[PDB]
Write an enzyme that holds these catalytic residues in place. Structure first.
Site, PDB file in Angstrom:
ATOM      1  N   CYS A  74       0.827  -1.209   0.000  1.00  0.00           N
ATOM      2  CA  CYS A  74       0.000   0.000   0.000  1.00  0.00           C
ATOM      3  C   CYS A  74       0.859   1.255   0.000  1.00  0.00           C
ATOM      4  CB  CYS A  74      -0.978  -0.028   1.163  1.00  0.00           C
ATOM      5  SG  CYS A  74      -2.344   1.192   1.066  1.00  0.00           S
ATOM      6  N   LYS A 129     -11.142   8.322  -4.750  1.00  0.00           N
ATOM      7  CA  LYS A 129     -10.537   7.206  -4.072  1.00  0.00           C
ATOM      8  C   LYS A 129     -10.723   5.935  -4.861  1.00  0.00           C
ATOM      9  CE  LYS A 129     -10.132   4.841   0.342  1.00  0.00           C
ATOM     10  NZ  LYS A 129     -10.804   4.588   1.647  1.00  0.00           N
ATOM     11  N   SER A 170      -7.320   0.150  -2.054  1.00  0.00           N
ATOM     12  CA  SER A 170      -8.018   1.111  -1.192  1.00  0.00           C
ATOM     13  C   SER A 170      -7.056   2.226  -0.890  1.00  0.00           C
ATOM     14  CB  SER A 170      -8.457   0.463   0.127  1.00  0.00           C
ATOM     15  OG  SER A 170      -9.404   1.278   0.818  1.00  0.00           O
ATOM     16  N   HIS A 182      -4.232  -4.480  -1.560  1.00  0.00           N
ATOM     17  CA  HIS A 182      -4.323  -5.182  -0.289  1.00  0.00           C
ATOM     18  C   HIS A 182      -4.789  -6.611  -0.490  1.00  0.00           C
ATOM     19  CE1 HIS A 182      -3.354  -2.338   2.895  1.00  0.00           C
ATOM     20  NE2 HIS A 182      -3.970  -1.389   2.209  1.00  0.00           N
ATOM     21  N   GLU A 233      -4.254  -8.980   1.147  1.00  0.00           N
ATOM     22  CA  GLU A 233      -4.360  -9.658   2.445  1.00  0.00           C
ATOM     23  C   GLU A 233      -5.684  -9.405   3.181  1.00  0.00           C
ATOM     24  OE1 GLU A 233      -2.624  -6.894   1.830  1.00  0.00           O
ATOM     25  OE2 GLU A 233      -2.888  -5.538   3.543  1.00  0.00           O
ATOM     26  N   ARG A 243     -18.553   1.974   8.373  1.00  0.00           N
ATOM     27  CA  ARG A 243     -17.967   2.956   9.267  1.00  0.00           C
ATOM     28  C   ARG A 243     -18.157   4.375   8.724  1.00  0.00           C
ATOM     29  NH1 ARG A 243     -15.420   5.061  12.978  1.00  0.00           N
ATOM     30  NH2 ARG A 243     -13.558   6.376  12.797  1.00  0.00           N
TER      31      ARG A 243
END
Lengths: 289, 289
Positions: free
Chosen positions: A135, A156, A184, A227, A229, A241
């Site tokens: 990242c 984004k 992300s 990502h 993972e 969130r």
């Protein structure tokens, strides 16, 4: 197979998926993780899941900066499980993972701990066989070692994106023509900058997500912009969130059935994630040093 | 990592994909392959590709029936590289693969070498830790050990089919929710028969292709009904062959872009194949015996 500090939450979590970590005393691989994530416990679990899928013995050492501005993770956990650069200057490691951070939007040099990071990065050039940068770390490393700048994106990049292999590497043994990986992030690096550095090679990329994996010719440095993972749910939790904070934001791309956030997401990038980290451990490290 | 007989064509073929076989002198895994395929050289290459993707040392032993009715493969190759049951009765093996055969349409007992096969199968119950049975072999074994009968299909199952995991197993660590595997066969076994045998468990299946993987509770017997080991081109070559014999037959399913046979096929089942055979070697064998 994988060895970790005694009370790590990951032990009991991973135990639920058949992955039996351990906490006791060819030799084991020494794998260092510099965890810069805000949710350090989650990231541990996600990375340890993939370092453990293997017949090789891995010993994991968890590293942090001496600069701590409290984000999410509570101070007790960092105090119990994490060590500093100073306690490991003198050791050598077979592999090293430096994880993402929520820091894309500042210039590199105006990050609290850029100077610490820089010393560690430089050290890893000599004391770690293969270093993987994920990242924002991919960007930090591409910048620090090769002068490769980052750029803000119009918006984004948040979702699961489809990728192809651009250049053969053992890292992609077992891969299909096309695979998926989550991204992300609000910034990016560019083919066109990277293209000017012969030491670098682009191993995988996406038409939607751009450059995904870049590496040294020796693969002693590997830069991952996404990502792989992440859990099925990682993007969902972030989405719920932000929405709960009454922020208006894009539904993550190619993640929710029909782009419906109550409908649970389909796991499409596990295969890639697992192949990728196995290959790293087996091909980039074990069969080389 | 993987060791094989000196002049095997696979050596030079696999060498082209970075996979460096060897031919010289924890201990290596002993993996036996009873190659019943008509094109024995191709199958060797396909299986060896997947047994080699690993950090474990594998020693491979190639076995054949003493009954030879010449199909495709020339007699010289079988004479040079293959051994008989008699030369291995007395040894024990960690793993054993029994491959497909073009024999679905006869009753089991009316196959030339059923009685030889039966003796070998029975032996493997005691001298092989984990035995994997592919294609027609899955049927032979499900039949011989558990009384599970096969049935003719209205037409041929030939293509790449989508599958889900029906029951958790270490064999499917790293898998996505859905994965692809090739099937190429005129017969099948059934959930409804298998369901009556508690010792058996269905690990993966497809709505189009039916039962794909079944196993013992101990996973010392694994039954695979498809051909995860096939090359991108395997189905294409079969198709071109049959069409060239002026036989009218179905275009293989979900294989050709737009079902166009000049347009090259998209490789979608490599990930599964590689995960699956790594897991077998690591989880079903190495960490157990």
């Amino acid at each position: 197979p994988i060895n970790v500090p005694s009370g790590l939450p990951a032990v009991k979590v991973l135990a639920k998926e058949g992955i039996f970590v351990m906490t006791e005393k060819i030799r084991p691989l020494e794998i260092l993780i510099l965890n810069l994530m805000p949710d350090k416990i989650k990231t541990e679990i996600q990375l340890l899941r993939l370092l453990g899928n293997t017949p090789l013995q891995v010993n994991v050492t968890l590293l942090y900066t001496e600069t701590h501005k409290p984000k999410h993770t509570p101070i007790e956990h960092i105090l119990k499980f994490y060590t500093t650069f100073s306690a490991v200057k003198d050791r050598k490691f077979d592999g090293f993972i430096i994880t993402g951070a929520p820091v894309e939007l500042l210039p590199f040099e105006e990050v609290d701990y850029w100077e610490e990071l820089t010393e560690i990065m430089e050290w890893s050039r000599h004391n770690v066989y293969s270093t993987m940068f994920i990242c924002w770390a991919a960007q930090a490393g591409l910048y620090y070692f090769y002068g490769i700048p980052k750029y803000e994106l119009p918006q984004k990049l948040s979702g699961v994106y489809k990728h192809r292999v651009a250049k053969d590497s053992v890292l992609f043994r077992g891969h299909d023509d096309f695979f998926w990986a989550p991204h992300s992030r609000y910034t990016e690096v560019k083919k066109e900058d990277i293209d000017k550095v012969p030491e670098l090679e682009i191993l995988a990329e996406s038409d939607e997500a751009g450059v995904y994996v870049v590496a040294n010719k020796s693969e002693r440095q590997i830069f991952v912009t996404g990502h792989p993972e992440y859990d099925r749910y990682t993007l969902r939790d972030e989405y719920y969130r932000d929405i709960g904070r009454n922020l208006k934001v894009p539904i993550p791309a190619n993640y929710f059935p029909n782009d419906d956030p109550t409908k649970t997401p389909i796991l499409t990038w596990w295969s890639h994630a697992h192949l990728f980290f196995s290959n790293w451990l087996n091909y980039c490290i074990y069969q080389k040093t």
